[PDB]
């Protein structure tokens, strides 16, 4: 601790005093993860392998719920020309645990795959399919010559070159405003058909259902651990909770917008999160020019966590507690002060307010001074400071 | 202004004890006042009374306190023991002496009567 | 405040970003600790005026005056006065926030006030100058009367009346304090403005400042490193701004409280340890004496003053 | 000062962005109002003797 203060002061000599120098904080011992123990596997492998994709004229919509997903096998696959995510990382998708997923499928020109990003502008965006600004998901696309290109032009695929008003995000509607693509294997890649699938997740504000492959683990209570419930992740000590959650509630939110209670996803159990113990650490030290001894005060946390002495200000370690009061040297708090005294030790004690005295009062007695002393008292007052500019 | 250019009647403003005077001194970015103060010391107990009933009239001290050294009564200034004889000019009078609680019987000396006797002799 | 704990959770990714902003997260701690120690200094200056812990004589024949309302109750656990017990009833973490206990506990303040009050009762202003010199309370009141320009006989001839009025007035204060809490507003506001500030600071953790989410753990669990720091630094900026605003407000408020404590200490010195010839400095009317009383984070002075009444005209030359 | 009128003009687009900065506007307005009433207190304590 003494050297901790020395660094904190950027000095090799530490004058007598009490210095705040660090923060005691309990590290977690193990990591606990909980997820709803569903067995179903998600049907993603089918949306990427459908015989016929839709066209932005009537772009196709599919919804995913109640299943376990694995996006690593999809991200690493070779067929996918572009796979870019917004509001979430491609590798992380195995860590989160969602309420629902929307998969939108369509075909589009290769030149127009630049036009699908969220908040982007262009005819395929404002007239066919607009992604909003608040989009959180992944855009996926790959060239599809052998699927959606054929001799004579695959006229089956349509799009809108004009509309009387720009689209609201995720809207669909059904001179003439429509035109078909000229998908011929002879045509250049920019005009070749690209199959595009857009996955928009709904992050958890409710019981998550489309959720990652992470293995659930049996939990523990009354011990600071890392916890992860449906992707709600943090560190703290779990305990049984007396809060009466309504059946549709998943977690309790505190004044500081932090989750103080969570429902175990695989049980009706309701658990309370407590940020496991922490506090400030101060160093009660006499002048290094007098002694290298030292004592440590852990503020606001008592001694079963970190001689040892418990005080209203915190847990004091190193200093020795003695019950006889002094004009107190180093102020610890709540009447306790510390000092260094000759064995040589740091004593801690309740301060003395002053010498106890009683005036000899009576209804007929008065004391009068017979002599006097002239006293010269110093009083130093700062009048100004350096005129810095 | 108040301690150096004058004498401060405010207690504990210009140092502990009764303020006599002060002296300023310069200091780097500051001023040091040397407060010369008067501190009483070596006190003694004394029995006391609020007033004295002499002729049936209650006598009070114009300044100071009535203090007895055990067998005699004197009037002495408040802050320094200097026992003076209780004269009709060290004191004043207000009415009958049954109205004051704690009054004490004693005589108050009058400087005129010796002159009266001296003239009567001559 | 553990400014690292406030700005960042218990996460190293955010701590590293916060680190390369420099010494802000130590300047704030320095300022707050300065305020914290200044509070101790203020209380010391106000109540450490007395050199010794005087205490009342066992018998209470103070010329008819009845101080039992303001003197400590011998039977109480904390040796507080009856009035002090009215004041102490009429005034009413998880993010790095902490409250350090004051150095002088409330019973220590009560001890100081009782020592001052006993010194005043048994020795007048003499203990303020040097060592206490006992004096019958009737004579002390007589000399204060003389101080306000009234011949001391007026007290002695009216002592039984002057006691009653005093004993009456000290009753009135009780009725004022027990019935109406609003009297303590001056202290309560100071408490409120502090709590209200605190309630604001923590609330600022519930805002985005432009990031994607207020909660930092979700940002970490969604964005990896390069695209995650771009958002985390937004919260760093927002929360540094909020904490700096809080510390500036606290510095100004602590300066105000420093001024108030200096005034209180001056009043204690010039009205409890003596008699103030300064008009209206200690109560309306001519000042006779003052009695200090402790209160949560404050001091209450009972100014006993002399008010003329029932005036008559006369012709003069 | 009405910061929402100072920081942002008449547009709602600026107002919505300012809103997600939290209670900064409330804090500033509260401080300025405290100063305003403090001036009345200052005049009162001087001339209401
Ligand atoms: C009043 O106090 C002064 C000292 O404060 C006394 O003078 C001292 O007398 C002793 C006698 O042995 C000397 O040794 C000291 O040197 C003196 N001090 C000074 C400063 O001169 C004085 O006697 C006291 N007066 C009374 C009446 O007791
Ligand atoms: C109170 O003071 C008086 C006045 O000095 C004392 O009486 C004197 O005592 C001395 C001897 O100590 C004699 O020489 C004087 O003649 C006395 N004068 C008078 C007027 O009586 C008296 O002894 C003192 N009493 C006490 C208890 O100190
Ligand atoms: C002071 O002396 C007077 C006498 O000089 C005392 O007055 C007498 O008191 C007794 C008892 O109360 C009465 O019976 C007498 O009639 C009183 N005589 C006069 C002339 O008043 C008085 O009591 C004494 N007071 C003290 C405090 O000793
Ligand atoms: C001083 O005043 C207190 C009240 O302020 C008096 O206390 C009362 O005493 C009577 C008689 O025992 C009780 O019936 C009351 O209940 C008491 N009131 C309180 C509020 O305690 C006390 O008697 C007075 N003492 C003197 C010497 O006048
Ligand atoms: C489904 O699509 C994925 C992604 O291109 C591919 O790896 C997989 O082989 C497809 N399924 C079948 C049965 O071919
Ligand atoms: C899921 O967990 C519950 C405990 O709440 C258990 O009863 C159930 O059997 C588990 N699921 C399966 C498929 O076993
Ligand atoms: C304090 O330091 C000085 C200079 O190094 C040294 O002379 C002195 O002995 C030190 N104090 C003590 C108590 O050793
Ligand atoms: C901490 O202190 C409280 C009250 O003094 C006590 O109940 C508690 O048991 C202490 N800590 C532990 C771990 O026991
Ligand atoms: C301190 O208190 C304990 C009991 O609480 C007592 O036994 C001990 O004697 C006290 N200290 C001294 C020096 O007596
Ligand atoms: C004189 O006063 C002292 C206190 O300073 C006291 O102890 C002593 O008893 C008093 N003398 C008498 C005779 O009462
Ligand atoms: C002083 O107190 C005693 C106590 O026995 C009492 O007899 C006496 O009358 C009282 N006198 C005054 C003046 O207070
Ligand atoms: C006495 O003073 C009062 C003050 O209000 C005045 O009204 C009254 O006229 C005065 N007496 C005489 C006789 O003037």
What share of residues of chain A is helical? under 10%
The profile of the biggest β sheet of chain A is:
6 strands, mixed
Oligomer status? part of a larger assembly
Beta percentage of chain A is 35-45%
Gyration radius over CA of chain A? 36 Å
Tally of alpha and pi helices of chain A: 5
Quantity of strands of chain A, as a count: 26
**Heteromolecules bound:** a molecule of 2 linked components (NAG-NAG), 2-acetamido-2-deoxy-beta-D-glucopyranose
Describe the protein's architecture and organization.
Chain D: It comes from Severe acute respiratory syndrome coronavirus 2. Chain D: This is Spike protein S2. The structure is cut from a larger assembly and holds four copies of chain A. The first copy, chain A, has helices at 2-9, 44-47, 72-75, 123-128, 145-148, and strands at residues 17-25, 31-34, 60-64, 67-68, 82-86, 97-98, 100-109, 137-143, 158-160, 178-180, 193-202, 210-211, 224-229, 232-240, 251-253, 259-263, 270-274, 278-285, 295-299, 308-311, 314-317, 320-321, 330-333, 336-341, 345-350, 365-382. By secondary structure, chain A is mainly beta. A six-stranded mixed sheet of chain A has the order 2-13-14-17-16-15, with no helix packed on it. In chain A, strand 13 (224-229) and strand 14 (232-240) form a beta hairpin. The radius of gyration of chain A is 36 Å and the shape is elongated. Chain A starts with a helix and ends in a 7-residue tail after the last strand. Chains in contact: A-B, A-C, B-C, C-D. Chains A and C meet through strand 1, strand 14, strand 18, strand 23 and strand 26 of A and helix 3, helix 5, helix 9 and helix 10 of C. Strand 26 (365-382) of chain A pairs antiparallel with strand 2 (30-49) of chain B, so a sheet runs across the interface. Residues 289-290 of chain A line the site of one 2-acetamido-2-deoxy-beta-D-glucopyranose.
């Amino acid at each position: 601790p003494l050297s901790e203060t020395k660094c904190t002061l950027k000095s090799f000599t530490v004058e007598k005093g009490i210095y705040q120098t660090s923060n005691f904080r309990v590290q977690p011992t193990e990591s606990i993860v909980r997820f709803p123990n569903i067995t179903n596997l998600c049907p993603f492998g089918e949306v990427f392998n459908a015989t016929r994709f839709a066209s932005v004229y009537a772009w196709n919509r599919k919804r995913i719920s109640n299943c376990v997903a694995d996006y690593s096998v999809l991200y690493n696959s070779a067929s996918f020309s572009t796979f870019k995510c917004y509001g979430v990382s491609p590798t992380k998708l195995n860590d989160l645990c969602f309420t629902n997923v929307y998969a939108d499928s369509f075909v589009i020109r290769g030149d127009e795959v630049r036009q699908i990003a969220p908040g982007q502008t262009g005819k395929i965006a404002d007239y066919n399919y607009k992604l909003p600004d608040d989009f959180t998901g992944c855009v996926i696309a790959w060239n599809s010559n052998n699927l959606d290109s054929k001799v004579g032009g695959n006229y089956n695929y349509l799009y809108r070159l004009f509309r009387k008003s720009n689209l609201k995000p995720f809207e669909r509607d059904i001179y003439f405003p429509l035109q078909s693509y000229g998908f011929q294997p002879t045509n250049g890649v920019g005009y070749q058909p690209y199959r595009v699938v857009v996955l928009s997740f709904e992050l958890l504000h409710a019981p998550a259902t489309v959720c990652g492959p992470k293995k659930s683990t049996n939990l523990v209570k009354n011990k600071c651990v890392n916890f992860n419930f449906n992707g709600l992740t943090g560190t703290g000590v779990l305990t049984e909770s007396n809060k009466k959650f309504l059946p549709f509630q998943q977690f309790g939110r505190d004044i500081a917008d932090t989750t103080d209670a969570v429902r175990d996803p695989q049980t009706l159990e309701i658990l309370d999160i407590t940020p496991c113990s922490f506090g400030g650490v101060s160093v009660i030290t006499p002048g290094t020019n007098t002694s290298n001894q030292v004592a440590v005060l852990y503020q606001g946390v008592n001694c079963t966590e970190v001689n040892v002495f418990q005080t209203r200000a915190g847990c004091l370690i190193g200093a020795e507690h003695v019950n006889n009061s002094y004009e107190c040297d180093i102020p610890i708090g709540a009447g306790i002060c510390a000092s260094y005294q000759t064995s040589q030790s740091i004593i801690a004690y309740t301060m003395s307010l002053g010498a106890e005295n009683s005036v000899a009062y009576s209804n007929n007695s008065i004391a009068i001074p017979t002599n006097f002393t002239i006293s010269v008292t110093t009083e130093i007052l700062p009048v100004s400071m350096t005129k810095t500019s | 202004s108040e301690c150096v250019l004058g004498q401060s009647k405010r207690v504990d403003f210009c140092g502990k004890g009764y303020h006599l005077m002060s002296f300023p001194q310069s200091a780097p970015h500051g001023v040091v006042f040397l407060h010369v103060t008067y501190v009483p010391a070596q006190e003694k107990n004394f029995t006391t009374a609020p007033a004295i009933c002499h002729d049936g009239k209650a006598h009070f001290p114009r300044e100071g306190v009535f203090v007895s050294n055990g067998t005699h009564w004197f009037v002495t200034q408040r802050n320094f023991y200097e026992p003076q004889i209780i004269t009709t000019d060290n004191t004043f009078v207000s009415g009958n002496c049954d109205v004051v609680i704690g009054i004490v019987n004693n005589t108050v000396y009058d400087p005129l009567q010796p002159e009266l006797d001296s003239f009567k002799e001559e | 405040v553990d400014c690292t704990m406030y700005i960042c959770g218990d996460s190293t990714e955010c701590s590293n970003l916060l680190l390369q902003y420099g010494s802000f997260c130590t300047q704030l701690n320095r300022a707050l600790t300065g305020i914290a120690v200044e509070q101790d200094k203020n209380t010391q200056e106000v109540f450490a005026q007395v050199k010794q812990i005087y205490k009342t004589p066992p018998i209470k024949d103070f010329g008819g005056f009845n101080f039992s309302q303001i003197l400590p109750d011998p039977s109480k656990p904390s040796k507080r006065s009856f009035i002090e017990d009215l004041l102490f009833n009429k005034v009413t973490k998880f993010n790095g926030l902490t409250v350090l206990p004051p150095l002088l506990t409330d019973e220590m303040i009560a001890q100081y006030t009782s020592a001052l009050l006993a010194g005043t009762i048994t020795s007048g202003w003499t203990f303020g100058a040097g060592a206490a010199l006992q004096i019958p309370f009737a004579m002390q009141m007589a000399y204060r009367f003389n101080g306000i320009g009234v011949t001391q006989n007026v007290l002695y001839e009216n002592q039984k009346l002057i006691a009653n009025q005093f004993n009456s007035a000290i009753g009135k204060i009780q009725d004022s304090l027990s019935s109406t809490a609003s009297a303590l507003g001056k202290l309560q506001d100071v408490v409120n403005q502090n709590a209200q500030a605190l309630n604001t600071l923590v609330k600022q953790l519930s805002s985005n400042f432009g990031a994607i989410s207020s909660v930092l753990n979700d940002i970490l669990s969604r964005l990896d490193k390069v695209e995650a720091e771009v958002q985390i630094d937004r919260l760093i900026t927002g929360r540094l701004q909020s904490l700096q605003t809080y510390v500036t407000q606290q510095l100004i408020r602590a300066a105000e409280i420093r001024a108030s404590a200096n005034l209180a200490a001056t009043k204690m010195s010039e009205c409890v340890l003596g008699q103030s010839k300064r008009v209206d400095f200690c109560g309306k009317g001519y000042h006779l004496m003052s009695f200090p009383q402790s209160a949560p984070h404050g001091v209450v002075f009972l100014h006993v003053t002399y008010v003329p009444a029932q005036e008559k005209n006369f012709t003069t030359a």
